Write an enzyme that holds these catalytic residues in place. Sequence first.
Site, PDB file in Angstrom:
ATOM      1  N   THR A  32      44.458  30.988  91.472  1.00 59.23           N
ATOM      2  CA  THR A  32      44.662  29.780  92.349  1.00 59.23           C
ATOM      3  C   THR A  32      46.428  30.079  92.015  1.00 59.23           C
ATOM      4  OG1 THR A  32      44.945  28.267  90.528  1.00 59.23           O
ATOM      5  CG2 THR A  32      43.035  28.973  92.543  1.00 59.23           C
ATOM      6  N   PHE A  84      45.841  19.521  94.177  1.00 55.07           N
ATOM      7  CA  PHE A  84      45.335  20.400  92.975  1.00 55.07           C
ATOM      8  C   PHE A  84      43.806  19.112  92.396  1.00 55.07           C
ATOM      9  CE2 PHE A  84      49.529  21.527  92.906  1.00 55.07           C
ATOM     10  CZ  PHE A  84      49.678  22.221  92.398  1.00 55.07           C
ATOM     11  N   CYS A 124      43.945  19.155  89.123  1.00 60.42           N
ATOM     12  CA  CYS A 124      43.733  19.786  87.964  1.00 60.42           C
ATOM     13  C   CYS A 124      44.615  19.425  86.525  1.00 60.42           C
ATOM     14  CB  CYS A 124      44.871  21.023  88.879  1.00 60.42           C
ATOM     15  SG  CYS A 124      44.901  22.497  88.263  1.00 60.42           S
TER      16      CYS A 124
HETATM   17  C1  HEM Z   1      48.400  26.709  93.002  1.00 61.88           C
HETATM   18  C2  HEM Z   1      47.404  26.814  91.323  1.00 61.88           C
HETATM   19  C3  HEM Z   1      46.728  26.291  90.955  1.00 61.88           C
HETATM   20  C4  HEM Z   1      45.444  25.211  92.337  1.00 61.88           C
HETATM   21  C5  HEM Z   1      45.361  24.893  93.444  1.00 61.88           C
HETATM   22  C6  HEM Z   1      44.850  24.351  91.415  1.00 61.88           C
HETATM   23  C7  HEM Z   1      43.499  23.756  91.967  1.00 61.88           C
HETATM   24  C8  HEM Z   1      42.783  22.869  91.022  1.00 61.88           C
HETATM   25  C9  HEM Z   1      41.449  21.660  91.467  1.00 61.88           C
HETATM   26  C10 HEM Z   1      41.514  21.607  93.430  1.00 61.88           C
HETATM   27  C11 HEM Z   1      41.166  21.723  90.853  1.00 61.88           C
HETATM   28  C12 HEM Z   1      39.651  20.102  91.114  1.00 61.88           C
HETATM   29  C13 HEM Z   1      38.391  20.967  90.873  1.00 61.88           C
HETATM   30  C14 HEM Z   1      37.386  20.240  91.331  1.00 61.88           C
HETATM   31  O1  HEM Z   1      36.959  19.009  91.814  1.00 61.88           O
HETATM   32  O2  HEM Z   1      36.089  21.150  90.980  1.00 61.88           O
HETATM   33  C15 HEM Z   1      41.687  22.104  89.795  1.00 61.88           C
HETATM   34  C16 HEM Z   1      41.015  21.800  88.006  1.00 61.88           C
HETATM   35  C17 HEM Z   1      40.976  22.377  87.228  1.00 61.88           C
HETATM   36  N1  HEM Z   1      42.600  23.010  86.939  1.00 61.88           N
HETATM   37 FE1  HEM Z   1      43.501  23.724  88.593  1.00 61.88          FE
HETATM   38  N2  HEM Z   1      44.635  25.045  89.778  1.00 61.88           N
HETATM   39  C18 HEM Z   1      46.050  25.344  89.702  1.00 61.88           C
HETATM   40  C19 HEM Z   1      46.047  26.565  88.462  1.00 61.88           C
HETATM   41  C20 HEM Z   1      45.889  26.097  87.572  1.00 61.88           C
HETATM   42  C21 HEM Z   1      45.862  26.977  86.331  1.00 61.88           C
HETATM   43  C22 HEM Z   1      47.232  27.403  86.145  1.00 61.88           C
HETATM   44  C23 HEM Z   1      45.391  25.985  85.309  1.00 61.88           C
HETATM   45  C24 HEM Z   1      45.885  26.298  83.739  1.00 61.88           C
HETATM   46  C25 HEM Z   1      46.580  26.900  83.077  1.00 61.88           C
HETATM   47  C26 HEM Z   1      43.935  25.133  86.201  1.00 61.88           C
HETATM   48  C27 HEM Z   1      43.241  24.400  85.487  1.00 61.88           C
HETATM   49  C28 HEM Z   1      42.395  24.347  85.190  1.00 61.88           C
HETATM   50  C29 HEM Z   1      41.285  22.962  85.153  1.00 61.88           C
HETATM   51  C30 HEM Z   1      41.451  23.311  83.286  1.00 61.88           C
HETATM   52  C31 HEM Z   1      40.874  22.028  86.155  1.00 61.88           C
HETATM   53  C32 HEM Z   1      40.065  21.405  85.372  1.00 61.88           C
HETATM   54  C33 HEM Z   1      40.177  20.418  84.559  1.00 61.88           C
HETATM   55  C34 HEM Z   1      39.476  18.405  84.574  1.00 61.88           C
HETATM   56  O3  HEM Z   1      38.681  19.029  85.311  1.00 61.88           O
HETATM   57  O4  HEM Z   1      38.996  17.926  83.665  1.00 61.88           O
HETATM   58  N3  HEM Z   1      44.410  25.012  87.310  1.00 61.88           N
HETATM   59  N4  HEM Z   1      42.232  23.240  89.941  1.00 61.88           N
END
Ligand code: HEM
Length: 455
Positions: free
Chosen positions: A264, A389, A396
Site C-alpha cells: 500500500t 484508510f 488502518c
Molecule cells: C498508504 C498506505 C496504507 C493504506 C492505504 C492502508 C489501508 C488500509 C485499509 C483500507 C485498512 C482496512 C482494511 C479492512 O477494512 O479490511 C487497513 C487496515 C490495516 N492496516 Fe493499513 N494501509 C496502509 C499502510 C499501512 C501500514 C504502513 C501498516 C503498518 C505499519 C498498516 C497496517 C494495517 C493494519 C494492522 C490494519 C488492520 C487494523 C485492524 O483492523 O485492527 N497499514 N489499512
Amino acid sequence: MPQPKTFGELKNLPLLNTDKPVQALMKIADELGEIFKFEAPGRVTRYLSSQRLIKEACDESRFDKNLSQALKFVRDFAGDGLFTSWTHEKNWKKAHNILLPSFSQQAMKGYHAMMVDIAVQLVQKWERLNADEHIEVPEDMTRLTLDTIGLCGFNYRFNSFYRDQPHPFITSMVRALDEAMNKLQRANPDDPAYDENKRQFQEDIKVMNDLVDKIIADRKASGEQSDDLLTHMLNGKDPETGEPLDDENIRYQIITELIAGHETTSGLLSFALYFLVKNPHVLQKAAEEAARVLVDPVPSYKQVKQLKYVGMVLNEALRLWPTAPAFSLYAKEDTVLGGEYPLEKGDELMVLIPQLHRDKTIWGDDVEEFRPERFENPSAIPQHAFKPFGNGQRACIGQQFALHEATLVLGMMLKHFDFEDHTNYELDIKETLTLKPEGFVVKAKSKKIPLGGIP
Ligand code: HEM
C-alpha cells in the site's frame, strides 16, 4: 438492484477472471450506479460506490468488518494478526489495545531514525546511477518500504538495496500473497492441478515462520531493546486483561505489519510521483516546499511535519488511486440500506473506495483532475467522503506510519532530484492485493545537494 453479466453456475465470477479485477469492477460501477449485486457460486456481495450509501455502511452500530474471501486466504499466513481477525475475536481487542501506542504520532518520533536510514539508502542509490540510466519506481519504492518495516518491526535488515534477488523471506511473502489472490478464481481448489501450488504455499509459510520465530526467540534470550514493534510487544501488557501477547501472536503481528504496510505504502509513493511528473507545476510547488523546509543534511521529525503541501499531494494521490481499494462489511442485523435496499443479517457489502472518491456530488465535476489544493482545508471534506484508510475501530492502524514514511521520502526525493518522464509513461495499473503503476520509470538528475551522515 442492477447486476453485471452472468455465466450460469459461475454467476458473475468469470468477470473477475482478469489481471485487473478492481478496474473491472469500477467500469461496471460506471454503468450500473451506486450499488450492484455480484454473485459467485455459494456467495453474494453488494458493491457500494456512493458516499450516500457508504456513510450508512460505516455506521458501526449496523455493520462490522467482514473477513472477505481474500482476507480468509491471507489468514493462512497472517493468522490472528490485526488485519485478519474478527472484531469480536479476543486477540483482536487484545492486540489492538497493546499496539495502539506503537502506532501513534508520538511513536513516529522513535521510528524516524530508522525511516531516515533506509531513505538515505534510496537517495544514495539514485545519486550513484550513471548518465542515461533510469529508475524503476515501484520496484525501488517497495525495496524501501519492505526494508523500513523490517527495521521498525523487528530490527532486521533485509538489505534490499544490496541485492538483485530479494531476501528469501520477501520472495516467500510475495509468493504467498500471490497464491492467496490466485485462489479467488479457483472453482476446484483440491484439483490435483493445484498440488504444486499447495506445496509451494506451505514452504513459503515455513520460510516466513522460521525467520520470525527465530528472531523472537533470540530476542527473548538477548534482552536487547530497540525502537521496534517486537520490543514493544515483548514488554507490553493489555490494559484490559493485563496479559501480554503470546509468542505465536507476536509472530503473526510482525508478518501482518509487513503484509499490510509494504505494498500500500510503496503504491502510494509510486502514484504520487506519477501524478507529479504528469503535473509539472504541482511538482514545482512541492519541490519548492521541500527545499524551504528540509534545510538540514538529514531531515528531522519536526521538519517532516512542516511539509504541508507534500501531505496534500499524498492525499490527492490516495483520492484517485487508494492503494487498498476495497473493504468488506457485514450487516449485524436485518436492516434497510439507504431506505430502499433491504439487507438480511450477515449480508456482505463491499466499499469501492476509488468510486467513492469520484462521487461528483461530493467533490465536484472535476473529480478526474489531480488537484492537491482540494485538501487545503480539511474541514471542507464531508464525513465519510474520503476513506483510503478504512473505517472506525477497524481503520488502518498504520495510517500515521504510512503518511510519515511517505512524506519524509517524497520530501527527500523532491529536495535531491529533478525528475523526467522520459518515456512519456502511459498509466498501467497492476493489481495484486493492492494497486500500483506497473512499469513506471523516470530519470532523476541530481541537484547535487549534500546528504548528511547517520548513526
Ligand atoms: C498508504 C498506505 C496504507 C493504506 C492505504 C492502508 C489501508 C488500509 C485499509 C483500507 C485498512 C482496512 C482494511 C479492512 O477494512 O479490511 C487497513 C487496515 C490495516 N492496516 Fe493499513 N494501509 C496502509 C499502510 C499501512 C501500514 C504502513 C501498516 C503498518 C505499519 C498498516 C497496517 C494495517 C493494519 C494492522 C490494519 C488492520 C487494523 C485492524 O483492523 O485492527 N497499514 N489499512
